[PDB]
Amino acid sequence: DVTLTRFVMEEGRKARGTGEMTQLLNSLCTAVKAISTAVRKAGIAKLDVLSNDLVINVLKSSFATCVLVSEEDKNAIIVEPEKRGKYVVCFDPLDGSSNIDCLVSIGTIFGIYRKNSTDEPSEKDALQPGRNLVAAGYALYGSATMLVLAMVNGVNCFMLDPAIGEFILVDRDVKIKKKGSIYSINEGYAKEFDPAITEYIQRKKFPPDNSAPYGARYVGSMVADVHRTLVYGGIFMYPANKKSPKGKLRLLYECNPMAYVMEKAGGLATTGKEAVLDIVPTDIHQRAPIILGSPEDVTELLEIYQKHA
Amino acid sequence: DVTLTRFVMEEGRKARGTGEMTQLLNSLCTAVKAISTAVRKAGIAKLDVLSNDLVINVLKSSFATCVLVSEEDKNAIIVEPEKRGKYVVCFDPLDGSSNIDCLVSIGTIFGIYRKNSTDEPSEKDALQPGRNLVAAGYALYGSATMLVLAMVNGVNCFMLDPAIGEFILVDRDVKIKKKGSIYSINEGYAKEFDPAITEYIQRKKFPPDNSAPYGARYVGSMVADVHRTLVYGGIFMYPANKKSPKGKLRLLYECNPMAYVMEKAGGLATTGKEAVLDIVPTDIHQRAPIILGSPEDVTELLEIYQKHAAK
Amino acid sequence: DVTLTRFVMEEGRKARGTGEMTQLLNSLCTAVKAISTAVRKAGIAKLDVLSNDLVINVLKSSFATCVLVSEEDKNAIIVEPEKRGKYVVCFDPLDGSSNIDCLVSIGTIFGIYRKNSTDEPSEKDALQPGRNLVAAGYALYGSATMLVLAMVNGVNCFMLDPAIGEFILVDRDVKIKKKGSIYSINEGYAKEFDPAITEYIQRKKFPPDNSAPYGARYVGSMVADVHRTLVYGGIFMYPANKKSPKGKLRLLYECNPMAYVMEKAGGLATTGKEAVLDIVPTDIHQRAPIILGSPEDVTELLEIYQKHAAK
Amino acid sequence: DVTLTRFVMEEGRKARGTGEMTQLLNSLCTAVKAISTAVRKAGIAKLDVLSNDLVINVLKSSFATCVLVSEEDKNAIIVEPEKRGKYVVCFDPLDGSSNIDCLVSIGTIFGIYRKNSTDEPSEKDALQPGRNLVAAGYALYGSATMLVLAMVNGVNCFMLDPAIGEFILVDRDVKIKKKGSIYSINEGYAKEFDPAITEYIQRKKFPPDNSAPYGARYVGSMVADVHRTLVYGGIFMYPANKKSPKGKLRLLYECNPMAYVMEKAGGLATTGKEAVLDIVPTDIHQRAPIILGSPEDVTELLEIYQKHA
């Protein structure tokens, strides 16, 4: 019976916020419901772009933002002085484009930052390390629509009841299991994996200790593979290959938001040499290898890396 | 503008049917919508058991049914005499159990067969090779809901407009791509694959012709991985392993209906040694290893198998 | 559990129909859902024109239609030859215009007739007395959406479950109450009523038998006031006045279909001098005064009319 | 593009409210959407009571109330000390019961009050005159679902987009037309009307000045007849008859909330001798004759009354 609006509103009162951030989040939610309806093809009797147009618009109207970065735009959107609020938002309107046409789960990922600089708003305002995130999360358009919000005191999962257009709290304080039995990677790149990644895979299939082999799962949508990682445990890997030197997934709105959710839930997120949330961005569309999930599974792979010095 | 309701009514007419089989499809459709709405969690403020009850119940009220086989039931279900029809229906009420809790795509699989017999309806009526199907179909509850239906005439895809509860033809007389670039399998069983499967995988990662490697995709729900296979091309496979020697997927309401759809769409479906559609089942819950998808992809693998048997 | 889709398919079968007319109902249903969703303002974040386009378009794609008459069109619409069927359809796409803006109940009225002729389909095919209808029906977009359908066999009501886009039988073989207690008319035209209507009203407020006065109800939408009349009993009336001498409501897609439903349900429908169903129209947009509802109520009024003509 | 949540939230920030009232209104809205879905019979493949159970529950959880009065309960609901907020709410969960079964428009009416007394919460806390209302309004389940909210600075109309479960602002600052051409009453009681009511009707049908006669309309649901009055202008009348000496409609949750909406929109609401909002309630289920709508139409009838001294 507890709804996202009420949760968000409450959290607003504790913090003693002025109402801007709350406003922002209500706005986000609404955009998410408008995308969910669109993705379930209501009125079917473009998608990548509809999404973006929605997140941009509803965000601007929140009067809570000053800088926007979307995976759909070369340049940072600087907001009109008259709609200008204090937050910097980095979103991925519709994540999982390769999966759109085959009807497989796709999502929306976001990250909220606070204007640090005291100068005119600009792209550098979104080049803050993931560690500075105030809020981060995602909406999965799967069998059902779900919004996962992460904030300092934890990760919570709200189910969208499309009947009355309300997200309902379904999981109180998500924590990922210490150790899982599922691995996610696209193994199509085997020929260009680095030595650590290569050795890790072998262990998941031929465990030296003779334990059960991990199961494999890779939806092809970061948002779906990641959500499963949070919920079932296990590991997700989009490492840097020879064809994609710096990884494929993008730091600001794909790597950072999900890293934050992972740690806030007791998991880890690393590039293999460094915590993702600690990297200082040099480009709003930068890419960075990513490995995330159960603390023990990630740690194991890190040990292989240092072992490969 | 062409609704599924319209499509089936027209098809039944062109076939000069008595409407029983047309009723059947309508009922299967109504159930799909019902299952969809529940899966999307409308009214939230077990999913497998509900799906099953809906199908069993709808199929009975159809008055088109004589025998039913659910993956949810130890034994076939024989329809009471006042409600009997000439049709046998093999269904998997909700496929992709491992993905339910994590909100990934899941679906409903179905296959339909005419009674082959004069005698009291029994289990035996359900033990017909996939080649004998009248229609095979799957509903996918993914980003959007899709119902795919295959009949002697071809494969068609309909999207569910949840705004009006209607399925709308979106892709007509669908044909799978001859050769793809995406391979779908659970590599976790690697230690247990046979030499052919193993050789094949290596070949998707390290192509001898030095071309670009196939990309990998494996949702975990046979309805999801198969649908993508139909629409993007490529190949899907769930071969035999230790835990399941004979394959995991079930012949009657998993392999057969998908192999039917896949072949109507100009694709292949093999266990590795024979055509899935030609196996004569002897147990309604029988399992079978399966390889399906684009012709050149399954063929390449079949050649690896033949190459090993030939040695 | 009995859907409208199922009901019509079964009915068509029992009638041994070729399915054309069955297709027609399906198409009318699909349109109703479509109109409903628009009326409920889904996707908001002209209603009369949209309704019309939907119906005209759906009815044509049905391939069951030869001629169409819309209250929205100056002239009958003749269906192109490749899409022709044997059916003539008189419809009012959205009834209750005065109530649209204020969000009160509005609906869609329809009547269906077989072509009576050998000759090129024309307007003339639509000029058949209401007695000649195969089916008459109305969808009410009120608190909930309801589709009422009447055929030679009776009147049935189906509720729209918008969760699954399906109409569900809720009231079967409906029969209007013999005598009611609610009278429905626009008393604003009082200065212009004829002596009978006037006497009658006075009689509902000051009953000579000293019983309790009928209560008054008048929504302004003929679909709303008629539906209530069918379900609670009582009487509805829109007689002749100065601004409309011949009555306001239209014979073909307002009076006729409602009189058909009302009679199948054991009720009456008169202009005051004759049965609405028996008038032979001579203009597709012709008007007629109407009195309908419970038998004893319309009869009481008819007696007042006869009593004046007799003097 | 402006939603009820954002409007309500904003108004919250101007007033510099602590968030309780805002919370309350978000709660109300949600209850209203849950009733709308129920009334459109979603899941049909009791109503009077479902409604009440919803309004009670969601209101209690708002933590914004201390006293509730529903047309469905003999006694005032006094809220548990631990969920106790400062507001007193008077609602009519589902108005138009006689109309439920025939599918004709029905609604939900509410009125919000502020705890005046400093003693233990009790029924007297809801016996405040309508004039003290802080907020009042209604939700009409018609062809479409609409929420009309009235508050000190005006009346606004929000359309419920059932697609994404959001009310959308559709009318900025409602004002009723000075004069209408529609009258609403149940004329079935003609034999027990008082002289003023009787004479008024005659004028609407046989205007002495020979002008056009008013049209008649009476849905049978206060919420529908009243909403039409607001939107098209004209008059609505549920006068006291001989069979119902004090009127039928009830002061706290039927007469008062709609009076407030009417005045706040430039119209009038009277019992024929007195402004409705000025009556001091002596019972939570009291009844009081009501006449409301266009200022000129109501005033005309008042003149007949004083003329009938």
Ligand SMILES: Nc1ncnc2c1ncn2[C@@H]1O[C@H](COP(=O)(O)O)[C@@H](O)[C@H]1O
């Ligand atoms: N709705 C909310 N939920 C959680 N934290 C919030 C909320 N509103 C404000 N805060 C915290 O308080 C700060 C000030 O909020 P504001 O004045 O609304 O910008 C934010 O940076 C948050 O860290």
Ligand SMILES: Nc1ncnc2c1ncn2[C@@H]1O[C@H](COP(=O)(O)O)[C@@H](O)[C@H]1O
């Ligand atoms: N709706 C339909 N779509 C496709 N084929 C049909 C349909 N109805 C009947 N048929 C064909 O005609 C046969 C007899 O149908 P029935 O009389 O409905 O049992 C079926 O087994 C179908 O192969």
Ligand SMILES: Nc1ncnc2c1ncn2[C@@H]1O[C@H](COP(=O)(O)O)[C@@H](O)[C@H]1O
């Ligand atoms: N779905 C149906 N419901 C009721 N009667 C029908 C139906 N279909 C056909 N009939 C009866 O059979 C006649 C021939 O129908 P058709 O062959 O569909 O044009 C119609 O005019 C109806 O009176």
Ligand SMILES: Nc1ncnc2c1ncn2[C@@H]1O[C@H](COP(=O)(O)O)[C@@H](O)[C@H]1O
């Ligand atoms: N959301 C709101 N909209 C309009 N007025 C409000 C709102 N919140 C508070 N107010 C006004 O400010 C007072 C204090 O609100 P609160 O502290 O939230 O109880 C209320 O009695 C209202 O008169």
Ligand SMILES: O=P(O)(O)OC[C@H]1O[C@](O)(CO)[C@@H](O)[C@@H]1O
């Ligand atoms: O096909 P690949 O290289 O495995 O890419 C999969 C990834 O691509 C993305 O679409 C990034 O564009 C992610 O959403 C997903 O995780």
Ligand SMILES: O=P(O)(O)OC[C@H]1O[C@](O)(CO)[C@@H](O)[C@@H]1O
């Ligand atoms: O999890 P595994 O062993 O890879 O098997 C996955 C398969 O399980 C199934 O649920 C069959 O039971 C299929 O839907 C899916 O393809």
Ligand SMILES: O=P(O)(O)OC[C@H]1O[C@](O)(CO)[C@@H](O)[C@@H]1O
């Ligand atoms: O407003 P009036 O003149 O009372 O007429 C009301 C009638 O108008 C109509 O809209 C006919 O045009 C009917 O739906 C309704 O019964």
Ligand SMILES: O=P(O)(O)OC[C@H]1O[C@](O)(CO)[C@@H](O)[C@@H]1O
């Ligand atoms: O049938 P009557 O006496 O005109 O009552 C109509 C009124 O009754 C009520 O239902 C009050 O219970 C109102 O909603 C409506 O305005």
Ligand SMILES: [Mg+2]
């Ligand atoms: Mg994107």
Ligand SMILES: [Mg+2]
């Ligand atoms: Mg992305």
Ligand SMILES: [Mg+2]
């Ligand atoms: Mg199942």
Ligand SMILES: [Mg+2]
């Ligand atoms: Mg299955």
Ligand SMILES: [Mg+2]
């Ligand atoms: Mg119209």
Ligand SMILES: [Mg+2]
């Ligand atoms: Mg009309």
Ligand SMILES: [Mg+2]
């Ligand atoms: Mg009530």
Ligand SMILES: [Mg+2]
């Ligand atoms: Mg009431």
